[PDB]
Design a protein around this ligand. Structure first.
Ligand SMILES: O=c1ccn([C@@H]2O[C@H](COP(=O)(O)OP(=O)(O)O[C@H]3O[C@H](CO)[C@H](O)[C@H](O)[C@H]3O)[C@@H](O)[C@H]2O)c(=O)[nH]1
Length: 432
């Protein structure tokens, strides 16, 4: 009997439910905690579509008193409502896995239940190393004054520069600065950490965390990745356009679930897509007259472009043989999915941990990103730079060779060898 509690956003719910599908395939009784009302429609649509495919799971409504960052505040202030709900739960609980963003409000609740509690870090293991090493950084407070690099002993990245550090972590009066210094020291009071990653992309980061060379006192981390896409996530004009395209010729473009860019940069993106000369599938989120008539015509005249304003199935598009590239913000959910389908990534990091995640795939030899593009809103990337980066990555056949090997290691990390199978079964015996 396992208890799950994800945070808000599709970036947190998609990996959590993929973990539940793995636990259910290992024959578990999963009790999913659902903080209602849920934020986005795509979340509650993914829920009932997941609940329908698995009627055996026990959904537990977490009712909060009276958006993504707003539900953040109501849960951590009302986390004491869960320990009466989880104590009178039959069958008796055997474990509890929640999101890392909720490690502080749920640790007292988890310790009071007396069950082995864990966290599911939805980002990379390398970012988890930066998250764990951050309290050590702030105490040697030549920071952020003289700090030029962040050298974590033995991680998969060579050296994390100052440019790749999340900007709010360099400001002393920010939320994430306080959140990092408050959440990270509580990792030691845990039984373990699940991370959606496998040995084929973060071998050195996984071994450095378990080897005790990142920070002293960490619990064992478990690479239960890759979280392969499931069928309950699928809710058909897009697939019919990709079918009539040469394989490995479509450029998939997506920046996650929010895409909070500006109207200035969006014009250059679409302009850069047509200046590259490759057929593309652009996915944009508004939350409209931005596209140029000279570009809208060329998108239709050249028979190359697709632009959509809808929650597409990224797994099908990455799984389609026509898609050979991926312009990604390098959200770890998109990265692991891109690794599973062997689609080389063009890195365009925007906020937070996306510069570090982009270097993880860059060191792996199956991804290329430009340090000079910087964070979102810092400057304007011209369409020529975007057209050149796409031309550079698409012409680069060395990436698909490494991307293929990353696909092989991904398919090998779920089955007989399977660091996921090893980690999951190692957790089952502990939960006895
Ligand atoms: O049109 C779309 C857009 C997204 N997705 C899916 O929704 C998820 C999006 O997750 P990403 O990590 O790609 O994007 P987010 O912006 O949600 O990611 C954020 O939250 C993640 C979870 O914490 C990571 O931390 C990440 O670094 C951070 O940017 C993936 O399953 C992706 O395939 C779709 O199916 N269709």
């Amino acid at each position: 009997h396992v208890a799950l509690l994800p945070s808000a956003g599709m970036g947190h719910l998609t990996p959590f439910l993929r973990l539940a599908s793995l636990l259910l395939h290992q024959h578990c009784h999963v009790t999913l905690i659902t903080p209602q009302p849920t934020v986005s429609k795509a979340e509650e649509d993914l829920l009932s579509r997941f609940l329908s495919a698995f009627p055996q799971v026990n959904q537990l409504h977490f009712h909060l008193p009276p958006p993504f960052f707003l539900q953040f505040a109501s849960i951590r202030s009302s986390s004491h409502l869960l320990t009466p709900l989880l104590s009178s739960l039959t069958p008796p609980l055997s474990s509890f896995i929640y999101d890392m963003t909720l490690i502080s409000p749920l640790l007292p609740i988890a310790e009071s239940l007396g069950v082995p509690h864990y966290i599911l870090f939805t980002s990379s293991a390398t970012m988890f190393s930066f998250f764990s090493y951050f309290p050590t950084l702030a105490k040697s407070e030549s920071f952020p004054g003289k700090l030029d690099f962040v050298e974590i002993p033995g991680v998969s990245v060579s050296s994390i520069p100052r440019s790749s550090i999340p900007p709010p972590l360099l400001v002393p009066n920010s939320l994430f600065g306080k959140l990092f210094m408050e959440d990270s020291p509580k990792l030691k009071k845990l039984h373990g950490v699940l991370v959606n990653t496998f040995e084929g992309i973060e071998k050195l980061s996984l071994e450095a965390l378990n080897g005790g060379k990142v920070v002293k006192g960490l619990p064992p981390v478990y690479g239960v990745g890759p979280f392969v896409p499931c069928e309950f996530e699928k809710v058909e004009t897009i697939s019919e356009w990709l079918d009539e395209q040469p394989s490995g010729s479509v450029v998939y473009v997506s920046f996650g679930s929010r895409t909070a860019m500006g109207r200035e940069q969006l014009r250059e993106v679409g302009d850069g897509l047509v200046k590259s000369g490759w057929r593309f599938l652009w996915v944009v989120k508004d939350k409209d007259g931005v596209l140029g008539f000279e570009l809208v015509e060329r998108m239709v005249k050249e028979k190359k472009g697709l632009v959509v304003k809808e929650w597409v199935d990224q797994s099908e598009i990455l799984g389609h043989k026509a898609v050979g590239g991926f312009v990604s913000h390098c959200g770890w959910n998109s990265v692991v999915e891109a690794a599973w389908f062997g689609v080389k990534i063009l890195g365009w990091p925007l906020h937070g941990d996306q510069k570090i995640n982009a270097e993880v795939v860059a060191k792996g030899g199956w991804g290329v990103w430009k340090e000079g593009w910087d964070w979102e809103g810092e400057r304007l990337v011209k369409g020529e730079e975007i057209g050149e980066a796409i031309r550079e990555v698409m012409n680069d056949e060395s990436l698909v060779m490494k991307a293929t090997q990353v696909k092989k290691d991904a398919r090998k990390a779920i089955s007989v060898g399977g660091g996921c199978e090893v980690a999951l079964q190692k957790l089952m015996e502990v939960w006895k």
